[PDB]
RNA sequence: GGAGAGUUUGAUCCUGGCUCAGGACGAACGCUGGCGGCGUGCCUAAUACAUGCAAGUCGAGCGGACAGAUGUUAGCGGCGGACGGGUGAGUAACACGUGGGUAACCUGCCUGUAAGACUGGGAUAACUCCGGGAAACCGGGGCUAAUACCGGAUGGUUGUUUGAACCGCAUGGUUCAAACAUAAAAGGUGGCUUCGGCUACCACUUACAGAUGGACCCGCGGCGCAUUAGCUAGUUGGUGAGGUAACGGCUCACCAAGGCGACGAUGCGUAGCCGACCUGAGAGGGUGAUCGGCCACACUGGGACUGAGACACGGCCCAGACUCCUACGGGAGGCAGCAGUAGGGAAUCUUCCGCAAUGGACGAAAGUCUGACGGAGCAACGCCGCGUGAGUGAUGAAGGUUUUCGGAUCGUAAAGCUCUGUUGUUAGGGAAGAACAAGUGCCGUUCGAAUAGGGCGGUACCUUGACGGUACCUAACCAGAAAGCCACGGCUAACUACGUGCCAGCAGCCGCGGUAAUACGUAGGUGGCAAGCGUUGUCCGGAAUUAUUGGGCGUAAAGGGCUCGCAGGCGGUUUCUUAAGUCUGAUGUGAAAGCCCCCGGCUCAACCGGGGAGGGUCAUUGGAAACUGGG
């Protein structure tokens, strides 16, 4: 599955902009429907999940995998989540939204070290060069559409994941401790 | 008799073999005496790695290589080392 | 207790007996004996179908059946949902689940499985009542 | 199965052969025993040369084991030297 | 190379009533798995003694052998301390 | 590296139990359902089994047939059929795990090292004829070969006897020497022939090594029951003999009276065991599907034969029950091989394709056989991955739901506009997995008397894919074909309306329902997940809830009515000593897979692979000596 539903009501429920712009929260910064600790932990998990757009089962396992690394569990968990290719595409600015960036990847417009990767959840590593394929160099949505851990070149339409983010670069709305708490139940 | 043969590991449409020394009556993927190396015919070129000291130990005990194992030993130059040892 | 007293006569864990003990037998025709096999449902034949009065302070007519299971045990089951098609000699499927307010009723009949029909005009929680999705 | 049937026929026919050899070795062995019971050496000592024949005959044809013979020989030869 | 060694056990005799056969006992401390206190365990052994040297009470050495009967798998080696 | 919550009350603190949130499944059931990769799939009836298939091969051992040089195979013979495959019934046992021992062992095939392979003989299937059977078949006569069988010859074997010449753990072991007795064997194919033969290769005999597999013994470890306390009389030991590959009451005779047991014998009940697996902070508990090891079993009970190995899954023989045949006289059979059927059950698959790969049997080889295995089929049964659209878009449409009728909500959701083609459909293209073997040459080397032509190693050339035109790839077209399920009082994420009115119903718990029901049923919305979601069962956790880690006993359950004490548990001070505990080092081993760690390969992941680590109440052998235990 993926969530294909309305993007705004998620922002409105969580009380953050998931797009990062603010626009879901311009007119009605309150919960969807006529009524606009476990909660707060859950809210925070759903914050971070809905932002990056992954399903719980894959999210809980991406957290289990980040635990094995050395350092803060929450910190390293945000770092991998950021490495996901759909996100890296979206951060390099090849796409306007994460949902566009997904579809870019999923339909196979993207290259990673010259070779086709059609997997949003691909976990991009430092050194690896994100690019557009030659059939899709003149996509409208790409022409239409950057942090320091990345590097881009809008002439060639190819970026690079030069380093791992470090956490100050990542979404500061997120209290990752809460999510580490969420899972410790 | 003791044989040197390939044990099938790997997964459904991607075989990988370990070269094991084994009594003949043992089941293919079951009981074995010693592992001697590994053959990955799927990769291009087929990746082969053999630990000579054992291979020769077991040729000279008179474990007989199966047809493919024989040919794997040939290409690493074991069969030569075995033949030259019986003379010199 | 002292260590030496434990060495001599150890700790004894309790027994935790089944909430649903008619599910936890089988029956071997050829040997004529009970098996000790846990099962997640059972089949059985309704020998009686009626209504019971719940224990106070509850009040209703609670729809039950008296079922003889494949393993030859005879058990009262509750019939959930609004309105049912069970008569004597219906072949039913029982699951685990005591009904709190009915003394003697440790099993629920499964709706929609074997001769037990689904609940009619149910539209939320359908799966719990054996009812197919109305439109198309 | 074909090969079972053939084996059954052969197994019966190798068996009857084998009893011929066992019997003829039990003959040779018992002769020594009665000879040493009579306290006659010449008979006993010649019967032991024959018993050895019939005993090791069987060891040739698998029907006695190296070891099971070497027992039988020793046992009998101890009686012949016990004269 | 040298021979491999049979097991040796120093024990106490607890019968001599059988002909050529002593019943030695060996007392060792097995830990309890759960608790961790060491507990006295006794293992009787029948051993073969050809000259009936060892008597009830004696602290004897024994060595393992091939089976010498249904139960005897040991021979008397020495009588380290005699009875009182 | 470890989370709590609700519930005894009028209220309370404590005690105490109960219940829930988590994680797992060989799961099932209900509703729903797109695809791919990788696994899994009779847990019940070790019930009964239709049909097909799962073990053959060798004509370079051998006559005879039958075809037409040469090919084919009833039969004899060799080897295999003791493996591979299945199941877990029995088994509480040295069955298994771990560590040892055997100076009490056996070992076909393979490898190496040596010696050899001499000379004779009589048969007997096939065939052909005859007699009796309903059949299964079977009983007679005469023929015939063997690399079949049996004679002698010679052997380094094994006996027994006598030496010496060392050594260990009692029994003893090893190496040499002599005497005497006993012991072998085979040819077949190609070449070269001086036709006598000789040569290579395969086969044959014996000995000694090696490898491999098996056997036995022992220490130690892993169930419940005392509402099971005695148990044993080949029993326990001895002495002989017999038997075994081998030690041994293994067996028997005789003699002795022993043996085991409150450290739980014995009996009863339950169970295949292990690597592992699940859960847990860990200790621990639970499991022992798949995969690998070991054991046991093959309709049931019993016995043996052949063989290196069997007391033999697709072999004998006996007995019994059952099914089938039948001329009733006798015969035949044993899916706990792969499929499949019936039955039982909540419940578990195709009477499939190929030996291309990897193994295995036989063969000199080509091959042949192979339901092993590789593949495919079916099932959301599980794990992983990707979808079912994307950007923009108020006008905040209609419609729906609510409405203090203002409005709010569904809602940027939709449409509109602009895109994309994962997938889907269609059309081209299209793998790796393949190594080979064999045959051909050429080179080296080795045998050889013969540059003949074999062996062994190089190098070339050649040619075989079930999956499968399948994966994958390229091109074209369409947002078109692809979202459900549970919940929403609290625990617990997410609320309103109408209907119902202690009724219908709900429910895990506290409880809810008699007119304002956030708890019943429906609707809108919201929430949690998502090709799934719920429910049930079972296990672990939550349960510092059998507590060693980690609880208690004045009054909550809990101090023996009181003594005397056997075993057992525990033990002041100093010093010496040992070193059983204890601490520490080294060595051996604790398979592989798994788990964890580090890498590497599949577009990612799952999965797969490589290197490592871990894991013992472990064995062996050194140290230290305070503490515990000896003296």
Author numbering:
A (entry chain F): 2 to 37, 46 to 154, 161 to 200
B (entry chain P): 2 to 89
C (entry chain L): 2 to 137
D (entry chain S): 4 to 86
E (entry chain Q): 2 to 85
Original paper wording:
Here we present native structures of two distinct small ribosomal 30S subunit degradation intermediates associated with the 3′ to 5′ exonuclease ribonuclease R (RNase R). Like other family members, Bacillus subtilis RNase R has a central RNB catalytic domain, flanked by two cold-shock domains (CSD1 and CSD2) at the N terminus, and an S1 domain with a lysine and arginine-rich tail (hereafter, K/R-rich tail) at the C terminus.
The best resolved RNase R–30S complex, which we refer to as state I, had the highest particle number (28,143; 2%) and an average resolution of 3.1 Å. The latter interaction is well-resolved, such that the side chain of Arg148 in CSD2 is observed to come within hydrogen-bonding distance of the backbone of G1184 in h40. The N-terminal HTH domain and the tri-helix region (residues 477–534) in the RNB domain of RNase R contact the platform region of the 30S body. The tri-helix region of the RNB domain of RNase R is well-resolved and inserts into a cleft between ribosomal proteins uS11 and bS18. The binding site of RNase R overlaps with that of ribosomal protein bS21, which is completely absent in state I, suggesting either that RNase R displaces bS21 from the ribosome upon binding, or that dissociation of bS21 is a prerequisite for RNase R binding. Careful inspection of the cryo-EM density for h28 in the RNase R–30S complex revealed that whereas the distal end of h28 (938–945/1398–1387) is base-paired, nucleotides 931–937 at the proximal end of h28 are single stranded, with the density lacking for their base-pairing partners 1399–1405. Instead, we observed additional density for the missing 3′ nucleotides that passes behind the single-stranded region of h28 and extends towards the lumen of RNase R. In addition, this state appears to represent a roadblock, because to continue degradation of the 16S rRNA, the enzyme would have to thread the remaining 16S rRNA around neck nucleotides 931–945.
